[PDB]
Amino acid sequence: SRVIVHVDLDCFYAQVEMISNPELKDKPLGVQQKYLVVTCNYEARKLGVKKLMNVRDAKEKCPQLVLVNGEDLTRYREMSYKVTELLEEFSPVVERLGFDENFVDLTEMVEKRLQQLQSDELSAVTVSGHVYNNQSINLLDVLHIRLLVGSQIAAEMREAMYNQLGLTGCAGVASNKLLAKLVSGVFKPNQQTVLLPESCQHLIHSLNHIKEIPGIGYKTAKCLEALGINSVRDLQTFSPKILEKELGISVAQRIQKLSFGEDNSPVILSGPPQSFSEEDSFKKCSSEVEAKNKIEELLASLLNRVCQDGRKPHTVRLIIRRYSGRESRQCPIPSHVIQKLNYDVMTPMVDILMKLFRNMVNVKMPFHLTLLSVCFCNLK
DNA sequence: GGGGTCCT
DNA sequence: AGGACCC
Ligand SMILES: Nc1ncnc2c1ncn2[C@H]1C[C@H](O)[C@@H](COP(=O)(O)OP(=O)(O)OP(=O)(O)O)O1
Ligand SMILES: [Mg+2]
Ligand SMILES: [Mg+2]
Numbered sequence: 001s002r003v004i005v006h007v008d009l010d011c012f013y014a015q016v017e018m019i020s021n022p023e024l025k026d027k028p029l030g031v032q033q034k035y036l037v038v039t040c041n042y043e044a045r046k047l048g049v050k051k052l053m054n055v056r057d058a059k060e061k062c063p064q065l066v067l068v069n070g071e072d073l074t075r076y077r078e079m080s081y082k083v084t085e086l087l088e089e090f091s092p093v094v095e096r097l098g099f100d101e102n103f104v105d106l107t108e109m110v111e112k113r114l115q116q117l118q119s120d121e122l123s124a125v126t127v128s129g130h131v132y133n134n135q136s137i138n139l140l141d142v143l144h145i146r147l148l149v150g151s152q153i154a155a156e157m158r159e160a161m162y163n164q165l166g167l168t169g170c171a172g173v174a175s176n177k178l179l180a181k182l183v184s185g186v187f188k189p190n191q192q193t194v195l196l197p198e199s200c201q202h203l204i205h206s207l208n209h210i211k212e213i214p215g216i217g218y219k220t221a222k223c224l225e226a227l228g229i230n231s232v233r234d235l236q237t238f239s240p241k242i243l244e245k246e247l248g249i250s251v252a253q254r255i256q257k258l259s260f261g262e263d264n265s266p267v268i269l270s271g272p273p274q275s276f277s278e279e280d281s282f283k284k285c286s287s288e289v290e291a292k293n294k295i296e297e298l299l300a301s302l303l304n305r306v307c308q309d310g311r312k313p314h315t316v317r318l319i320i321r322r323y324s325g326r327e328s329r330q331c332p333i334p335s336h337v338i339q340k341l342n343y344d345v346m347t348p349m350v351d352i353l354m355k356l357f358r359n360m361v362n363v364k365m366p367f368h369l370t371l372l373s374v375c376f377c378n379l380k
Numbered sequence: 381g382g383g384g385t386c387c388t
Numbered sequence: 389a390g391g392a393c394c395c
Contacts, residue, residue: 012395033381052381073382098384098395217393250387251392270385279382328389373382 001143003106003150004267006180007087007157009169010189012100013070014041016079019166024066030058031070034281038070042189073099082165084270090157095177096270100169103177104157105267110149128155129171129192132183133199143197147173151194158192178263179203181214200261210235213258220255223247235259272379276305276313279373284323288354288363291372295353298374299346306376307341313376314338316349318356321371329356330377 009015013031018024018041028044030037037058040049047062058065070076080099087102088094095103117125127137128151138144154171161167171192172184182203183195195203207213210232211221227246229235236259243252257263278298285291295318306313317330337348353374361367 036381038381071382077383096384096395100395215393219392268385273384274386275384277383281381326390330389 001107001146002175003110003146004174004177004180005104005106005150005154005157006172006174006177006184007083007102007104007154007161007169008171008181008184009083009100009167011039011041011045012080013039013076015167016076017068017070020075021068024068027066028062028064030065030067032067033069033071037065037067040065079165079167083161083167086160086164087157090153093267093269095268101181103180103267106150106153106173107146109153110146113149113153114145125149126152127194128152129194130187132186132193132195133202135196135199137196143175147175147194147196151192154192154194158190176261176263177265177267178214178258179261182207204232204259204261207232210259213255215258216255220247220251232259272309272311274379275375275377276302276309277317277319277373277375278302279319279371281321281371283370285369285372286367288357288361291357291361291369292350292354294372295357295374296346296350298372299349299353302374302376303345303349309379311379312338314378314380315376316352316356317375317377318353318360319371319373319375320357320360320369323368323370326371327360329360330375331356332378 014029017029017031028041028047030040030044030049032055035055037049037053037055039051044062044065049058049062049065076099084094084096084102087104091104091106091109093105097103125139125145125148127148131137150173154173158169158171161169168190170184170188170190172180174180174183174195175197179195179200183193186193210216210224210229223246224235229238235256240256243256278301280294280298285294313333315330315332317328319326319328331352337345
């Protein structure tokens with residue numbers, strides 16, 4: 001049996017901004033990227049603003065909305081890493097999911113604490129936060145005890161995140177990653193909940209669409225929908241044989257297990273990132289001249305990042321998106337270029353990126369690009 | 381939107 | 389190199 005916590009920061013980008021400019025802490029705030037409000041603080045959500053909503057919709061429904069620009073992710077990324085490092089201090093196995101979510105495997109920590117316990121104050125063990133579905137605790141049930149100690153650790157985590165980084169968030173504690181992530185959002189914002197095993201089925205059947213299961217995305221949901229599968233129960237009861245043939249043995253067996261609340265995937269230590277990338281989207285790029293300036297701009301940003309990181313990238317990738325869905329070209333970085341960080345690495349790197357660009361884009365015939373991205377990977 | 385992961 | 393997933 002495992003004890004897993006999922007930590008999910010409240011309106012992360014908005015929190016980072018409200019900390020940067022505390023004069024926003026009291027007003028409805030929205031963080032904008034191009035024409036989207038990607039996230040907003042809880043005051044704005046109260047005024048009917050939704051995640052990933054159009055700035056037109058948002059401006060009309062809530063003309064008092066204060067917008068800050070969140071296209072440069074630098075500060076969010078930096079705070080994101082402070083959070084996971086703080087969690088890694090609790091237990092070293094921490095898996096990041098995007099910038100604002102972490103899983104921690106607490107089972108070793110829980111076991112250590114229980115061993116230190118006397119029967120005197122084992123009486124006595126208490127929950128911190130909400131119990132999912134108001135389920136009764138059985139102090140004689142060792143699984144219940146282990147999960148409650150988890151909720152205590154989770155509370156210490158949220159307290160340290162607030163006290164040391166100024167950030168609030170939710171936590172969900174359960175026996176695997178799927179359930180911990182489903183349960184962490186039951187009470188929001190800035191609260192936590194623990195899932196006892198006999199409420200597992202209640203949690204999974206509380207979902208309304210199979211897309212709400214982590215692991216089942218747009219494409220997979222579409223296939224399932226095609227098969228007449230709509231509820232969690234539908235997926236639970238659909239023919240394994242048929243499903244296996246429709247989506248392949250790997251996806252079928254995995255997602256069908258997910259529909260019963262079963263997930264044996266380990267919490268993986270994320271550690272340092274395996275790639276660095278920067279991108280810009282735009283309405284139109286139809287010339288190599290600006291394509292180069294664009295790319296130079298991105299390359300500038302990236303180099304600062306590999307600079308302070310330490311490790312060195314052994315491959316570059318250039319990515320594009322044409323009008324009306326992405327294409328990419330990569331190649332190893334010349335060994336001599338790799339030794340760069342106090343000379344002029346720009347020019348030779350731009351040279352390589354442009355060769356890659358022309359290989360993928362016919363510059364002798366009109367082109368219409370709508371995104372450019374540069375990615376460094378294969379770090380050593 | 382502006383990132384990131386892993387598998388095939 | 390592309391596809392699928394996550395935020
Ligand atoms: N398709 C997408 N789904 C989810 N998030 C996305 C997507 N595209 C970009 N993002 C970015 C923008 C959001 O600010 C952030 C998602 O954070 P998420 O944990 O879903 O909620 P949140 O931190 O905004 O608020 P809360 O956790 O309080 O609901 O990631
Ligand atoms: Mg969040
Ligand atoms: Mg999903």
